[PDB]
Structure 1
Amino acid sequence: VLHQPPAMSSALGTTIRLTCTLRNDHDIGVYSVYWYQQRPGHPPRFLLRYFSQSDKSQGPQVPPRFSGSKDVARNRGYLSISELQPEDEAMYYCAMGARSTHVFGSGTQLTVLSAA
């Protein structure tokens, strides 16, 4: 139901956009997209919930360089991370539903490269 690419890489200081793709006889225009970061040996950490530019919630202490968006026509939810830092290297999960249920995507492993 939720596709995420297995792995993405980007260099220090850049901006990357992770995609979470509602496949696809459901409408992303009616769901909040939840995003979580997970580092090995640690629990998931809530980053942000994104429904629209006027209906979103940033997680506690998550800097604004983590931001949500959507492409509704493509059934996609996005997590953008600007000014990538070495500690952003982690697993990123999207999730949908409010529970009731919370279905997770398979997660994108993000590698932050020392050099582009």
Structure 2
Amino acid sequence: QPVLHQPPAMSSALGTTIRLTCTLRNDHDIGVYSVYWYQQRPGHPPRFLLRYFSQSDKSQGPQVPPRFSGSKDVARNRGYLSISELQPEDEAMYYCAMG
């Protein structure tokens, strides 16, 4: 029931496109928050991937490829992180955050 929800695990084959989901509890409006996404590999610091509020208000992280991109489904209170051209290095933990 807590504030943000993320499936514990997702998997896909090389070269494909996947979309990770971040769901915000229905007692809050995602339409008022920007969604933040971070990537983290074993024994490494969290790495800011991108921040997305809307199509005219978003920003890419330092040296983070365009194949990484966010969006939203405000009706469903969902935050999205899409990664296409999936590569091995993409294997890692991904965290979303609101604000």
Question: TM bucket by the smaller chain?
Answer: over 0.9
Q: Which structure 1 residue ranges, 4+ long, deviate > 6 Å from structure 2?
A: none
Matched residues in 2 for 1:39 and 1:51: separation? 25
3-state secondary structure, aligned to 2:66: coil
Matched residues in 2 for 1:63 and 1:24: separation? 32
How does the TM-score come out when normalised to structure 1? 0.82
- Which residue of the other structure, out of 33, 36, 40, is the alignment partner of 1:34? 36
1:65 is the counterpart of 2:42: no
| Shift, 1:7, TM fit | 0.1
3-state secondary structure, aligned to 1:68: strand
| Shift, 1:40, TM fit | 0.6
3-state secondary structure, aligned to 2:96: strand
Identity score, percent: 99
Cα RMSD of the aligned pairs, angstroms, is 3.6
- Which residue of the other structure, out of 2, 5, 11, is the alignment partner of 1:3? 5
How does the TM-score come out when normalised to structure 2? 0.96
Matched residues in 2 for 1:61 and 1:71: separation? 26
| Shift, 1:55, TM fit | 0.4
Please list the CA deviations of residues 38-92 of structure 1 after superposition, one character each: whole Å capped at 9, or x if unmatched. 0010010000000001100100000000000100010000000000000000000
Structure 2 gap segments, 5+ residues each: none
| Shift, 1:24, TM fit | 1.7
Structure 1 gap segments, 5+ residues each: 97-115
Matched residues in 2 for 1:24 and 1:63: separation? 32
User: How many residues in Structure 1 have an aligned counterpart in Structure 2?
Assistant: 97
3-state secondary structure, aligned to 1:63: coil
